[PDB]
Nucleic acid binder design. Sequence first.
RNA 1: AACGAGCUUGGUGAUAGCUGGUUACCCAAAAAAUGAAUUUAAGUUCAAUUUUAAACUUGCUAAAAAAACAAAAUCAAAAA
RNA 2: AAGAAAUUCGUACAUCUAGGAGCUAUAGAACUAGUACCGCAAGGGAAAGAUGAAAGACUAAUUAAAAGUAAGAACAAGCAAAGAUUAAACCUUGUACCUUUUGCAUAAUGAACUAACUAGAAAACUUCUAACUAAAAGAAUUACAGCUAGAAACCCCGAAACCAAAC
Lengths: 140, 97, 58, 78, 166, 66, 95
Amino acid sequence: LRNRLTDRYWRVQEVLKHAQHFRGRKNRCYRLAVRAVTRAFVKCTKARRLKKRNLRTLWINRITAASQEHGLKYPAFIVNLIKCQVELNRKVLVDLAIYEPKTFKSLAALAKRRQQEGFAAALGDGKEPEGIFSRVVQYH
Amino acid sequence: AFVRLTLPPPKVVDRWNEKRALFGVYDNIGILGNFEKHPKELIKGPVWLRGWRGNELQRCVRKKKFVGNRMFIEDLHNLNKRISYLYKHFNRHGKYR
Amino acid sequence: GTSLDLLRSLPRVSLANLKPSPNSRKRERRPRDRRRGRKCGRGHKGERQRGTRPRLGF
Amino acid sequence: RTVSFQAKESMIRRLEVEAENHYWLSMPYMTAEQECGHAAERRAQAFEAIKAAATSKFPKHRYIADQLDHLNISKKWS
Amino acid sequence: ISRKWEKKNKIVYPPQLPGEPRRPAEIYHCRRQIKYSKDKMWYLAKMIRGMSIDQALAQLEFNDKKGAQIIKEVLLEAQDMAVRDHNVEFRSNLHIAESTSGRGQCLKRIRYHGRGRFGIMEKVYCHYFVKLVEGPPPPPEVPKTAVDHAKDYIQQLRSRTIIHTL
Amino acid sequence: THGNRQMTLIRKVEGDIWALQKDVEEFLSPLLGKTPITQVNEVTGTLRIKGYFDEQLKAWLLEKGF
Amino acid sequence: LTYCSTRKGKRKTVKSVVHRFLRLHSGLWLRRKAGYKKKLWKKSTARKKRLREFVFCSKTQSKLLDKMTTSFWKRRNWYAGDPYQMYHDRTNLRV
RNA sequence: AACGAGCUUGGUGAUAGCUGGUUACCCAAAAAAUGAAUUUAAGUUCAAUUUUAAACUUGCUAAAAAAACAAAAUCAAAAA
RNA sequence: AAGAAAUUCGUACAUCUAGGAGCUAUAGAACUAGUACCGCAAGGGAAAGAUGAAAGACUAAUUAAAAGUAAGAACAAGCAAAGAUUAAACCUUGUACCUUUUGCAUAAUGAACUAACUAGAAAACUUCUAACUAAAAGAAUUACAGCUAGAAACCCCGAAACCAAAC
Ligand SMILES: [Mg+2]
Ligand SMILES: [Mg+2]
Ligand SMILES: [Mg+2]
Ligand SMILES: [Mg+2]
Ligand SMILES: [Mg+2]
Ligand SMILES: [Mg+2]
Ligand SMILES: [Mg+2]
Ligand SMILES: [Mg+2]
Ligand SMILES: [Mg+2]
Ligand SMILES: [Mg+2]
Ligand SMILES: [Mg+2]
Ligand SMILES: [Mg+2]
Ligand SMILES: [Mg+2]
Ligand SMILES: [Mg+2]
Ligand SMILES: [Mg+2]
Ligand SMILES: [Mg+2]
């Protein structure tokens, strides 16, 4: 036995420290703990991407609740704000509804009015003056 | 795994004992001595591998030539069996032909 | 020349400072790791993996 | 099967784009003969660069400085 | 083998100051090699947990198991040393804080079967541990009342926060 | 080397090896039509050139009188 | 073949190669044509002429024949009056 | 206690084109598994593929007419 | 596959009664022993020990340290975890591992768990690094830039059989 590995104690502890919060023999038996830890790491990596998608669904759900209190569907509210050159994202809109109820109501009226202007422009045909809020500022 | 619960006793090495101090002296006996002696003649070891090197099969066959006739019965039986095993490995087995 | 002047500045040459010429030694590879382990470069089960392919010229 | 409404529309939109692709490819600025030779000089120069790189391989210089700098590993405060 | 239960009796604290509650006494005792299974001894050790010395000795005297007699003798020696060596005033003023069983060193033998076969037999042994603490047994458990259950429920509702937002 | 790479070597150089490189490039450049590819080894004091130019270099060195 | 012999520990030459081929010092090998003495009566005059020639070997055959012979068969030989004196070298070869 | 041929030691690390196994990390590239011979088809050798290094110069897509075919595979000018 | 001789060379450490980039209780001898035990016989053939200067000082200590248990049974829902969360469980996402198969498995082999042990080895040719160079090598060899030296390589376990001599 000329040369023998003298570090096996610390190589074992690297795996087992990640398994202390498991239940069963998975938290103390190396041949079992090693299989469980790698499955956990794979799940951890795939859940970094899925987290971002989940939060967007939460934002859209809460926005629909806030708009419907004022009689608006989600597609109408979001689309018309864009046509008014408002570039607030969904994450910040949720903050206003929860924490700034009066400001959110003001935005609700603005989106509704722009929708009405579009309806009038559609039904009326020919050359007619454009809506007050339907004027687009230009950049160069 | 289980590890020592105490430190082993210290090892103290004298780097200036006679063997260490004079290592290498007379390695140039030939060039500085008019070539009366070759440096290989300064080597101490088994009779059959002084100033010579080879693979395991070559070492086994060389040992038999030098001291084969002065060996014990059982030692010689094992040496002969080792030769035949090495012969079949080196001449019939391996990745490369 | 100028090279010998450099020695004067540098620390003493000793048995703790030796170095070989660069690229004079290659690395020898053992079959322990995943790249060079497992099947160890011999392929799938057969005569050649086991080590008993016929002789040269056959 | 029954083809869904989405699938029918999405295909139509892609058809319309390809129709315009056909139109813009029908009005060549230069005829075939006028094209001949108009870019010969640039093309020839390009290969010369490629050939030069291919035939430029050679070992690298070696310096006394690299070898002697190893001795600084034993520098100290005296 | 480890023998730490024995040494627990030799701890010495510094003298208590006048303005401090009187520290109760503690006694540790065990019997080491016993020809009895530890699984069986567990049921006996479990029963006397939390009881006073007199109530424990009363229940043991009318149990039919072989382990009951061995536990009783260990209890009697613990009581004797408590008064004699650990400055306990009244014999009756004691209760069982801890009692448990442990595995001992065992022996391997052969058990015969019917076709020249055999099996491995174990002759099993066990330990017994106790700790005696001076004072009346601590009061028992009282289940949660209906009012107590509700108060927890409102506390849970009050702890809520708005999740994943500013 | 490799059975197809031809080279010429000047070996026992003392002093400034880099000065010799500049002279060789000037001397050989008009013949080739391009600057020759060279390697300088400072440790061994040798100069290596791509292609066979032994005869010209031998005559060139004699003129300088080494 | 024998990579390591018992008595000397060396490689051995395959003597059936030495009896059939000739090696030129550059690395080429020469041979005859199989059947050049068999049933000549049934062979055309052009066929028989092709058989009489000495022929070279391919790259893969040359590689195999080199492994099966030792270095002694690859040295320089200075035979007075050699009839192969002019074929031991190559000229004007870019390769 | 196990005889279509006893048991033990040695020859013996018998032989096995068949079954199972073959222990640190990182970077890079990569297959088809078509043709030929073989007591050969559970295996091997050669071509073909892939690959590392080196020398130096044209390649890939496209490709008019004019052929050869019979009434889309060859072939590859000039250009891009 | 096997394989000479003729003919050349060599007094060698030479008290080195000495040495180790050899092993340290699953290693090194099978060995504390050819004993205990097994077989009618030839024959096969193990396991393990640990205080201190003093026990004519009561046998010493040291270690959250393996699996296994105890202290302390359990609480709708699911490869047992991950994103999370004020909050252990509730909500969402997710068809155990190795080998082998057609790059596919809810197919089929193998694994009760812990500790130790347990499997790629050679220099003909090539490439890289140096010495000297029409010559290189410390005798015998190679040479139309060669020659000398260094570094770089090719596994483990498993039959039914056959032969010799004992019992
Ligand atoms: Mg998305
Ligand atoms: Mg190796
Ligand atoms: Mg049992
Ligand atoms: Mg085998
Ligand atoms: Mg095919
Ligand atoms: Mg046949
Ligand atoms: Mg086969
Ligand atoms: Mg062309
Ligand atoms: Mg002789
Ligand atoms: Mg032993
Ligand atoms: Mg033993
Ligand atoms: Mg434990
Ligand atoms: Mg669940
Ligand atoms: Mg089956
Ligand atoms: Mg199983
Ligand atoms: Mg292990």
